[PDB]
Ligand binder design. Structure first.
Ligand SMILES: Nc1ccn([C@@H]2O[C@H](CO)[C@@H](O)[C@H]2O)c(=O)n1
Ligand SMILES: Nc1ccn([C@@H]2O[C@H](CO)[C@@H](O)[C@H]2O)c(=O)n1
Lengths: 208, 203
């Protein structure tokens, strides 16, 4: 049948990635996860200095056409070759990774609830919430330890782009969520609840 | 042991209608105890004094009786629930029976405030809605159902309801496992709470 389509959005470092991955792990082979943060437009032909200036928190930085195409293919029972973005080099990497069709599809990303075309594919819409100061702390650690950023560059990107875009584009999408999940990285009860809903949907698919 | 769900939120947040809708959905599988019917019996005080009482402070509630009844429901016993009269500012001399059930719902603005109540819950829900929208619903309900004047609602809201919401209610949101918006009309959140309750029922 139709998969269960779950959209999970939230600000940067809100716990949304960890929650989606945990749900994916709880369901095993019955889930396909498509992270929108790997779908930035391929601007690899542009010099680094130009890629450094792009605002990666504005909707137009994303290859929405491709993301939507992949989600639609998964919905038809077809596999897709998912792009992989290189946060260190600031470009779409040459690597790709296959994603197998499954009865539950999870679309996760800071802006997955922004485009009506994406929201119209979703059966369940989740927004993962956490205060900006706590998210900034996790973002700063993530950037310095995994993405080769300096503390100074993180502060500048955050104040000049991440925060303004979060207030203008990300936070208002919270109004479209069916449920809001706090403590996304460590919330066993909320995880069990999302899992129970998906399991009821899966049981519906096999029963007749 | 019955599955216990606590559902808090500000006044007119939609928590009451969400709590009642879950109950309909699960039929007799649910026993519901609204904490707003548990205000302390202050019938001995003069009317004028009762009108000035702050009904949004935790100490206005008869927590001892509420806790007592929650425990009795958990041991599989029925309880005699008090009924509060919002027009008369008084606990009714008559009570109403609540039968035990495998799912118990505790709902109220301050149900997540006492640790004693929180420790009893398997799932904690906070129903969120902005204060301006809640005030709109609170003003309408008070005038049409509780004999309040518009001026009376405004004074009670600014002098007590709002300050207590900011001081006691809103901070309890940090104890919730899930936050539910548009609690008065949220089909998906309802189906999801029901799905979790049925799973715990099967065990
Ligand atoms: N080249 C890039 C591309 C994206 N990002 C950050 O990734 C976050 C969304 O996952 C976004 O918040 C965005 O700031 C980044 O830091 N550098
Ligand atoms: N005699 C009373 C007792 C309670 N209340 C209001 O009931 C709300 C909680 O349901 C609380 O917000 C409280 O203000 C009221 O208006 N008058």
């Amino acid at each position: 049948p139709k998969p269960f389509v779950i959209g999970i959005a939230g600000g940067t470092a809100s716990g949304k990635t960890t929650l989606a991955q945990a749900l994916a792990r709880t369901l095993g082979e019955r889930v396909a996860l498509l992270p929108m943060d790997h779908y930035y437009k391929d601007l690899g032909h542009l010099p680094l200095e130009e890629r450094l200036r792009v605002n990666y928190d504005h909707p137009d930085a994303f290859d929405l056409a491709l993301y939507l195409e992949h989600a639609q293919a998964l919905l038809r029972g077809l596999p897709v070759e998912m792009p992989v973005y290189d946060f260190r080099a600031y470009t779409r990497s040459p690597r790709r990774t296959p994603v197998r069709p499954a009865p539950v599809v999870i679309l996760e990303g800071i802006l997955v609830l922004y485009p009506k075309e994406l929201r119209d594919l979703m059966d369940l819409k989740v927004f993962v919430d956490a205060d900006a100061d706590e998210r900034f702390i996790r973002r700063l650690k993530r950037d310095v330890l995994e993405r080769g950023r300096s503390l100074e560059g993180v502060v500048a990107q955050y104040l000049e782009q991440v925060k303004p875009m979060h207030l203008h584009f990300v936070e208002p999408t919270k109004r479209y969520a069916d449920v809001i999940v706090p403590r996304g990285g460590q919330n066993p009860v909320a995880l069990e609840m999302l899992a129970a809903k998906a399991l009821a949907r899966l049981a519906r698919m096999g029963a007749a």
